[PDB]
Amino acid sequence: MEHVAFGSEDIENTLAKMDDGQLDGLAFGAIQLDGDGNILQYNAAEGDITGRDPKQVIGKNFFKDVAPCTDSPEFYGKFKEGVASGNLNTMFEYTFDYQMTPTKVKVHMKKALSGDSYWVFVKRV
Ligand SMILES: *C(=O)/C=C/c1cc(Cl)c(O)c(Cl)c1
């Protein structure tokens, strides 16, 4: 296991060193999105939460195709406001229910250190 806690204040610094393999060592789901919501990285813990195969979702549009239940002001709206502003750091609970048993999670979105990239972190609640 990579020893990083969900919600850590410096999480973007810690995850900046991680290739796809290190990311798979986290205790929580981690997705990296570009500013348009395309999936750049998607770790094993996230796949365990959602059932999706991490390798297959990379390159897909998160808000349009993968996760339409997040296409709402409560999730996508927060993301895009952060992308527009350049300073995203928001945490909230949410239910994932698209083609899956509804699953309640805690979501933390945070701007990455790599230029136009944004993390979505997820854990069960
Ligand atoms: C609602 O449609 C959510 C779906 C969903 C959310 C996340 Cl974070 C995720 O990783 C997947 Cl594959 C689907």
From Swiss-Prot:
Keywords noted in UniProt: Chromophore, Photoreceptor protein, Receptor, Sensory transduction
S-(4-hydroxycinnamyl)cysteine sites (modified residues): C69
Disulfide bonds: none
UniProt xrefs under CDD domains: PAS
Single Gene Ontology MF annotation: photoreceptor activity
Post-translational modification summary for this protein: The 4-hydroxycinnamic acid (p-coumaric acid) chromophore is covalently bound via a thioester linkage.
GO biological process: phototransduction; regulation of DNA-templated transcription
UniProt xrefs under SUPFAM superfamilies: PYP-like sensor domain (PAS domain) (SSF55785)
TM annotation in the entry: none
Domain of life: Bacteria
Domain PAS: 23-86
Database matches in InterPro entries: PAS, PAS-like_dom_sf, PAS_fold, PYP
Keyword Nucleus assigned: no
Similarity comment: Belongs to the photoactive yellow protein family.
Protein role: Photoactive blue light protein. Probably functions as a photoreceptor for a negative phototaxis response.
Subunit annotation: Monomer.
Protein name per the record: Photoactive yellow protein
Provenance organism: Halorhodospira halophila (Ectothiorhodospira halophila)
